[PDB]
Design a protein around this ligand. Structure first.
Ligand SMILES: Nc1ncnc2c1ncn2[C@@H]1O[C@H](CSCC[C@H](N)C(=O)O)[C@@H](O)[C@H]1O
Ligand SMILES: [Ca+2]
Length: 375
């Protein structure tokens, strides 16, 4: 809407005025900035507040910035005059809260971060409070984008970010090409990527946002030079309900990965490349999914490179998966979810380990083959 659009314009003006992106980059430092979005969290916010208070002297020009970054309250009367009208607009938009007596502003459900040179509003509940969030972002998103060869992107390359969520992959691609498609089906992420597109001075002139199922985009007539996708891929036991952003399709959670890879020879232009990321089950030698990709090498002459950037024994995921299932469905604490997850890992997934894997796939490769990089 026009009032929201103007509010976001003024918010980006504020971020530019006070150098938000540089401050965020300084706080997390260059050895963490691209590792994970979980840097400013409930466990580090006190440290962030101390930095602003003592190293930046508590200057009022950073007050509204901290409401957005950590949720820290700022007294309404202490905001500079230009920041105070913007703060009122953000409260009206539901992007910040006012205290009940109207005397301060503080965090709502959106946290402001930066990643890959882009300013991004994300679901605050993933790093603060702990309540089940409605939009995902994780280190996996970052590791996808890290492996993209940005110098090979032309302005006229057609790129698509499927299952865009907050929009981070689409906004990254929009740094380099003027033709980006970003898709999702959730009302909440779709609203958020609209905001984040405007927040980075973009509009439908160079980035289309589309409400569309993954398989519809992939079956379509559109052809792309570059594709990214971090799709729902978590595998939950039969009977359990996850969330739209987490639960993968198929018996092992990887149905969306299968869907994408199978259509790449038809959806990419020859020589185009796709970047995917998923947490893949496997044995001691590696993720089971890579065995399915040999059909792509032989049948389509692709080059497929898998970058294994984190390994965990399956037993280390039982708690996190069970906790997530318990909270997402509001289950009580006497349910034996842990045994259900274990049995599912053992019997259906055959998962001794989980491999957090980025995969680059190229069509019409001059050096076809499958390559697995492990440390
Ligand atoms: N069939 C489908 N088609 C398109 N998007 C889907 C989909 N099923 C789930 N989604 C969306 O897929 C996203 C996965 S979370 C991924 C968010 C983002 N790509 C990131 O890496 O941070 C969620 O936003 C969810 O709404
Ligand atoms: Ca730090």
């Amino acid at each position: 809407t026009p009032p929201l659009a103007t509010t976001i314009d003024r918010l980006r003006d504020y971020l530019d005025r006070v150098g938000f992106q540089q401050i965020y980059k300084y706080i997390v430092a260059v050895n963490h900035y691209a590792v994970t979005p979980a840097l400013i969290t409930r466990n580090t916010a006190a440290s962030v507040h101390h930095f602003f208070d003592s190293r930046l002297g508590g200057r009022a020009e950073f007050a509204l910035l901290q409401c957005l970054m950590t949720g820290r309250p700022a007294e309404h009367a202490a905001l500079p005059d230009k920041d105070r009208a913007l703060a009122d607009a953000l409260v009206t938009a539901g992007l910040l809260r006012a205290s009940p007596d109207g005397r301060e502003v503080s965090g709502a459900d959106r946290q402001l971060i930066s990643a890959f040179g882009v300013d991004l509003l994300i679901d605050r509940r993933i790093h603060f409070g702990g309540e089940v969030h409605e939009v995902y972002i994780g280190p996996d998103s970052y590791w996808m984008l890290y492996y993209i060869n940005a110098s090979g992107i032309a302005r006229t390359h057609r790129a698509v970010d499927l299952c865009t969520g907050s929009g981070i992959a689409a906004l990254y691609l929009s740094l380099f090409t003027d033709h980006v498609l970003a898709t999702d089906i959730g009302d909440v992420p779709l609203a958020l990527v609209e905001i984040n597109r405007r927040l980075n001075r973009r509009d439908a002139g160079t980035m289309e946002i589309r409400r569309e199922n993954l398989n519809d985009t992939l079956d379509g007539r559109e052809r792309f030079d570059l594709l990214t996708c971090a799709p729902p891929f978590v595998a939950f036991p039969p009977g359990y309900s996850g969330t739209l952003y987490s639960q993968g399709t198929g018996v092992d959670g990887l149905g969306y990965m299968r869907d994408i890879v199978g259509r790449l020879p038809e959806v990419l232009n020859p020589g185009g490349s796709a970047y995917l990321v998923a947490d893949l089950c496997g044995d001691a030698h590696g993720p089971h999914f890579l065995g399915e990709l040999e059909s792509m090498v032989t049948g389509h002459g692709m080059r497929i490179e898998a970058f294994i950037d984190h390994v965990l024994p399956a037993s280390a995921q039982v708690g996190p998966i069970s906790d997530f299932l318990r909270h997402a469905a509001g289950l009580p604490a006497d349910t034996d979810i842990a045994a259900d997850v274990q049995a599912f890992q053992r019997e259906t997934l055959r998962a001794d380990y989980y491999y957090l894997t980025t995969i680059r796939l190229q069509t019409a490769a001059q050096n076809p083959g499958l390559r697995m990089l492990r440390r």
